[model samples]
Target: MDYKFWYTQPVPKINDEFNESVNEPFISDNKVEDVRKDEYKLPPGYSWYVCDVKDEKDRSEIYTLLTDNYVEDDDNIFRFNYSAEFLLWALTSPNYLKTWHIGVKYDASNKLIGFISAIPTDICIHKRTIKMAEVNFLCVHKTLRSKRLAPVLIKEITRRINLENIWQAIYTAGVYLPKPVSDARYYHRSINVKKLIEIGFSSLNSRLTMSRAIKLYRVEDTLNIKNMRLMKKKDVEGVHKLLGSYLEQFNLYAVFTKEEIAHWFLPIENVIYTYVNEENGKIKDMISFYSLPSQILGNDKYSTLNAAYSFYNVTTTATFKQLMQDAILLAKRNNFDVFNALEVMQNKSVFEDLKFGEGDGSLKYYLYNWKCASFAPAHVGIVLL
Candidate 1:
């Protein structure tokens, strides 16, 4: 658990007490001139470049690097395959900085071998809005992992964000770092139980047979929420109001504008799915999840696990349980193999009732240059993809 790189940064130590020293930046002197003007040096033959996500060529290279070298489960049976379209939507948000999408390549061939990206977001911590970078998609070539390149990539991104006068960052990882603001557990509900068992993603008890296991997780194919339909342009304003108020209850959450709502919530076919219930011309509830499949490596029968990740959901009239049940129903109807959600917000209220088993791994939320008291999973309101 030794974090030599993190110890030198501004984050809190693993056991730092935060009863009185939370909700403030660790470093107050964030002078742009003081920040490293030149890009951090990479190993010889490797040079840095700013990734233009809009360019198809850059997008494909980034996609290839991440799809092959990004996050993988412990057993390496599955790895995240973020589509090029998903990358575009995630990295190119409102007022996103182009320079924040950092990439490294070989000088001779210009083949992209490493990358790390940051996006601007305003998150409310203890009722105070702080401008911070959401750093993600950090990857290094598999062959170069032993070169200690990840630390340099992280430091370079930190320096870039520092030059912008933003000293705080928020990120999540399945691996443990120096400190975590909150801890959240993953829960997965089977949509295609047979396929899940086939891939060793789930299993049945000794007493239960394959048919019984399928019957246990089977959901109705119909949408139970009345007046439920895909979110439309007109619903953006109402959704903004509803979701904003709903998230305010959490100790930490993101404050979104109407435009951000439109970009994130408006359905992008096969990339994101969002539905809302309108009654008497008022938006009452909304449910959304993004598509992120994993490559089932070396499997003769299955190549991909069609997965849906819970994004943001808000409910006022419908119970949280009912809304999530219908969400699972939609996933089932869409041929998704599984539905995954973190035990954040009010998710745990329905996980047991909906039969979502706890996943094997947990995600830890961390902040850079900002210290805060630890929050329980229920207090966590942000979901980092």
Candidate 2:
């Protein structure tokens, strides 16, 4: 099949005008009293339904839940610029949106109140009959916090997974949720080790020194990176080598087969993968990436393609400047508005030179149904990110 430039990485988004759909009814606060169990159940008078938005009206409701901004319920102020292409892809991505999701709608005066959702990771480990779902993008209106809707949303999704006979689910949350409910571990990246300590991205296994950690020899003799081409199928084995080398040293996630790697890295979505090329007699050592369907906000078909993540960077002072420049250039070439290099991957100076401001909220991962989740978290493709 001939692939036309296929609607730039991260197709444009449209806000479905979700806020104006309903009005606030009387807020009812009730809790199910369970003396034996530690958690509470839904109270009387309030109804919670697992909704999948398909109709125009339902989609409108979903639109508001996804996009509207602010503290709680009001006129629909929060709206995401929905990408028709990506929306269609998400709805149809095999084992994707179909296999997992928890959309909670609270009905008081027939108005939507709260919602939380989980989507499967693009890549995962399949052991026997077990499959995992990565819980993400969990959100609730401030006024509804007292409702304790977050846990309920989670519970609803878990219940559905149980029905599917899927043994366990994996998720990365930011807020400090209760333990025994989830396990928090260090996020491993294919970065320099000393940089990890400098940025405070330490692991419980501090003895694992970066200096002794694995290193990739500089592959490029010349500084020209633009000449590098998109990796081909032949490069698969080599790519795996780079990834495996990283996994050997730290807390990684589940490992993938070659077939899984193909789908994980080459999904036909709004994403870009580029690398640095050798200008002289050497090969380039940098790899760059831009995530799909740029964040949704307003309805604009024309939006900048931004880099949501990056990796496979070396930690040599000799080629440091060139690596940073080439990586940023990859994002720029793809017309990305900005690049997200979360987790103090390198020393503070690396990001400082790149002009990336450090932010507090990073993705916190957890293994639900412990035995079923990734034993080594870092190996799972984008899950660790």
Candidate 3:
């Protein structure tokens, strides 16, 4: 599917538990009629708005404001509000577009005053039992930030989530704001780093170590593993074991297992799949992917493929180099424009060896009604909402 606004998505008519409303009682001191009217009321001089805009000028201005406000130096740059593209990604989703958003506008100054959005997301990790509202891109124009309008926008949206008993909210930002919430860490992995340096992935000032010892190879290089192809039913269990063996040592947030990986990485009927056996013809490196051409940062069109994600067992130096070369070749063969090697795995060296380009994006997670003290890994208990 190409990129379109989420608000335009035809919300499914199904009555399953996935998106059903929670049976939570509302607490109010006023009469039902009074409360009903109260819900519709907005504070004077401020308004809550959520929808796509048709005005060419207004759209241009919003884009300008976001692009200017972004901080490029932070390691967690992904956490910041970057551009109009981001707003569209969060707002245009078919399922998420219905959630609440608040923004401020000046009467004649023609300035943006403030904005915040509480978008919906259904995390399938918890068997889809938990419903979450992701709070994001809370921005108030520089002149108006000190006036408390930002908090107003947040509270207004929070009130809506509470009424629905959504159970939890997830959000992440570069700056630490100890305002009515707790904070948690985010997890990430990279498939290539040496390439990131050569390509100047981050800002110039933020550059770090750029060289290391690793065997680099071009896409056509042959390796110890052979007969790599789409994953089959029998390989799922082995792939799970491979991924888990590495993930168990991190003490970080939970990683997907093989069974869940199949449902996600390679669903039986999904458009993307993979399987790479060792040179002896035993399945060793397994990777899977799906296309998402609409939302890629650089090229939005003619982008036939954007790798959903790939998982593999980089058991040895030879195995790792082979998979790296094969992955690039695989993308070329399948008409993919961008390939994302998700999270940190055994192939860290492979990315370095290949000198591949890398950029940053993040997955913010949360633990619902769960205490940080109770977690064994401490990180696994938090869910990336």
Candidate 4:
């Protein structure tokens, strides 16, 4: 009766060891025709719908469903407010499959109630790079959580991916389900010191007064690092090379194509931003972050707290701390209230040097239908959108 849903899936047990030297699929040689033809059955009065993310009406509907129903802080103070424009860019990556954007809706009113989505990517686990789907945004209406629709959404997406002959997937969950390949911690830094303390997101240090706290955390208006510019179209190849060489150092990572590199790393207004340092006409290092604001539920003064998440950064000619210090200043100059990062790869050391306080949240990285040994947070290089 306990976790009957996940117990039936191909995932690691709650307490188990998978210290295998070779990484491979849990199910071997899957055939497209062998996969289920029909979609999984849903409860009465609900039905499956292939979401059209590009359509403004459909996209806004999805935005509302997730905005109101998606993940929130345990304290109920903040909820992730993924903008409509951000969702479009996120779901419409290069060569995105139309059928992979799945949804569940109430049949009576033709309104969306549940949603999940996947995008194709080539994930490199150790020495092997395999085609995999990055699944995200799984949500069910608050009134319908007891309907047990999450399992159905997960199963249907697996079937759809299997029909494409893909056997593995990667996902992250705030809650621990069974097993995780990486249990990563979250680190946060303040940009607006007074607002953070007033919002109860951060505590005022008893040792320091308000004016002193402001003086300590206030970021500079101008970047200290020079020779860096926003990523350009011509810089894609150079950035791709830098990222490829940088990411291969990790046991768990992503192998991005040049086109993928261009799509993900290039600046997209408020959604994504990348800056690369050039030395002698060659790209030496880079830093990037994405904008993801959260809705303030009970606060009367502020309705949204703009946050910048550390996306990817590679350092070659410059020290990691030097580039990261500028990253925080950039976030602050851009009017972001705070900056957040996961303790993966080289982030922890940078967090310490830059005074990024540890957050209470932890994220678990799960690999579907793959038998891979769990590793430390430092070995993970892939960030699923």
- Candidate closer to the true structure by TM-score (higher is better), 2 or 4: 4
Consecutive 10-residue window with the lowest summed lDDT within model 2 = 9-18
Report each candidate's C-alpha RMSD, comma-separated, in the order given. Answer: 1.2, 16.3, 12.0, 1.2
User: Tens digit of lDDT per residue, candidate 3, span 262-324?
Assistant: 554443322444654644434455554443322222432321123334434434424666665
Q: State the lDDT at 112 in candidate 3.
A: 61
Candidate 2 error regions (>4 Å):
1-64, 69-94, 97-99, 106-115, 119-131, 141-143, 164-168, 179-223, 231-241, 267-286, 291-307, 311-321, 344-349, 352-355, 360-362, 369-385
Cα lDDT listed for each candidate: 0.89, 0.43, 0.44, 0.88
Ranking by lDDT: 1, 4, 3, 2
The true-versus-predicted C-alpha distance at residue 63 of model 2, in Å, is 5.0
Of candidates 3 and 1, the better by TM-score: 1
Model 1 per-residue lDDT tens digits across residues 1-385: 6787889999999889797346788888678888878888888999999999999999999999998998988899999999999999999889899999999998898789999999999988878899999999999989788688999999999888888889898999998897988889899999999999999898888798999998898787676687678899999988998888899988788899888889888998778898999887888899999999999989999999999999888888778998999889877767789999999999989999999999888999998888778889898888988
Question: Where does model 4 exceed 4 Å of error?
Answer: none
lDDT of 2 by residue, 248-361 (tens): 443324454565445444433354364534434333354656453333233254332233356455422235556765666555555444455544233233565544555434
Task: Please give, for residues 73-178, the per-residue lDDT of candidate 4 as tens digits.
Answer: 8898999998998899888888888899999999999989999999989998877898999999999988898778999999999999988888899999889887
TM-score, predicted candidate 4 vs. hidden true structure: 0.97
Q: Which candidate leads the pack in lDDT?
A: 1
TM-scores of the models, in the order given: 0.98, 0.53, 0.47, 0.97
Model 3 vs. true fold: TM:
0.47
